[PDB]
Amino acid sequence: GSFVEMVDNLRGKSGQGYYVEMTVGSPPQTLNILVDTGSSNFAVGAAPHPFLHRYYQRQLSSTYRDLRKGVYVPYTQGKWEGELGTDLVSIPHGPNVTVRANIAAITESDKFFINGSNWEGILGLAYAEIARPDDSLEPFFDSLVKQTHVPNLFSLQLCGAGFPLNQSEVLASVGGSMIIGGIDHSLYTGSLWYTPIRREWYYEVIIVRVEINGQDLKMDCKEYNYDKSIVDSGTTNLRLPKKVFEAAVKSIKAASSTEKFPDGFWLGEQLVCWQAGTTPWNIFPVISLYLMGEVTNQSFRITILPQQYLRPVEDSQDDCYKFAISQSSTGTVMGAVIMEGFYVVFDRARKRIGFAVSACHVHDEFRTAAVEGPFVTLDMEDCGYNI
Numbered sequence: 001g002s003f004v005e006m007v008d009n010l011r012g013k014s015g016q017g018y019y020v021e022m023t024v025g026s027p028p029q030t031l032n033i034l035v036d037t038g039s040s041n042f043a044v045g046a047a048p049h050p051f052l053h054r055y056y057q058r059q060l061s062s063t064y065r066d067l068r069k070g071v072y073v074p075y076t077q078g079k080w081e082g083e084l085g086t087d088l089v090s091i092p093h094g095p096n097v098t099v100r101a102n103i104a105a106i107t108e109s110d111k112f113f114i115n116g117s118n119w120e121g122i123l124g125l126a127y128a129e130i131a132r133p134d135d136s137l138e139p140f141f142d143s144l145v146k147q148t149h150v151p152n153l154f155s156l157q158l159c160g161a162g163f164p165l166n167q168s169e170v171l172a173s174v175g176g177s178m179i180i181g182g183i184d185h186s187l188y189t190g191s192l193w194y195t196p197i198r199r200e201w202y203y204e205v206i207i208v209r210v211e212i213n214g215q216d217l218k219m220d221c222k223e224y225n226y227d228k229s230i231v232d233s234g235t236t237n238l239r240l241p242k243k244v245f246e247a248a249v250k251s252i253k254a255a256s257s258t259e260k261f262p263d264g265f266w267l268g269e270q271l272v273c274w275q276a277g278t279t280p281w282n283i284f285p286v287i288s289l290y291l292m293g294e295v296t297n298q299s300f301r302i303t304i305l306p307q308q309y310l311r312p313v314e315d316s317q318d319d320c321y322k323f324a325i326s327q328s329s330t331g332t333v334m335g336a337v338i339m340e341g342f343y344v345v346f347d348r349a350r351k352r353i354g355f356a357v358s359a360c361h362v363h364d365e366f367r368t369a370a371v372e373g374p375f376v377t378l379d380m381e382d383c384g385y386n387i
């Protein structure tokens, strides 16, 4: 019910990631670690890098164990490579436990570390199926649950500020909470609604209906989950499959048509600015994603505001934003800008993901984010994509 020791243990922002403090080795080496529900390796900087002010020094840890194996992880926008080993790991603002976990000691990388992000490694919280080099490398959370009495569940409250935070502010500000082993009721309002985890690899879910200001996008629901839909704190944007993105942007443009925005804005490349305090939130539509419910033929919806999908960026005294919805060729990605609207419960023990309105979501006096249900929805299993 209440996990005060873990409340407010995150820092960061949607554009650069949310991170938690961790310690590795004996004596403990403190590092800031990206919370990543879209990968499954615990991988930390272990050699000098221009964007790192600290890194894991294996030679200084008496509990370091060398697995004598390399790991090469190339991905779309970057790469990381390192040396596998194990060590004792703790989360200072977490459960009061120390676990023996796998650690990939990063020795070389490209477009992995971000200048000014304040994190030195990543915590892959998804399942062993997508761990590198293969599923035999036990992910951190699996080790934590196996070695302690920590319940097999974690929950995330990612807090977007609603305005830009400079270098000093982002270091001093609370970015949210990662509750390990439980649900903290102070982090949300209303009810938690659960969607099934379709398969344990990424945190895969099924979207059954999409609305833009109550208007049904009216696409075959398979299109929404082509080739998968995942919940990923390690992605900034709400990413949509090509056809869905094209249909959604046409509908968002139509709803906001009292103001014309350049093509570069809709491409998520160019910022849009308004005089201080005059952002016309009301012209932008709300977006509802209906998710498969736990009950047969039942769904629920999560509704986000433009305060979630317009990402605050510094320009002046103008309030500026980037459009945080973008195209994908690898399925839907419910990234940090979506997660910022909600308290998200990764209930691994019951193979389900919970959503509730976040106590820290940004809104205005007229509209709020929402999590509502139930809705009668038929043939929802057909919304899932196969092959």
Ligand SMILES: CN1C(=N)N[C@](CCC2CCCCC2)(C[C@H]2CCN(C(=O)CC3CCCC3)C2)C1=O
Binding pocket: 014, 015, 016, 017, 018, 034, 036, 037, 038, 039, 040, 073, 074, 075, 076, 077, 112, 114, 122, 130, 132, 232, 233, 234, 235, 236
């Ligand atoms: C999309 N995504 C993740 N969720 N994690 C990784 C890895 C995915 C693995 C999936 C399984 C197979 C191997 C690759 C790596 C992170 C590291 C930094 N990254 C940023 O984009 C910078 C920030 C932008 C907002 C938060 C971070 C991405 C990724 O590419």
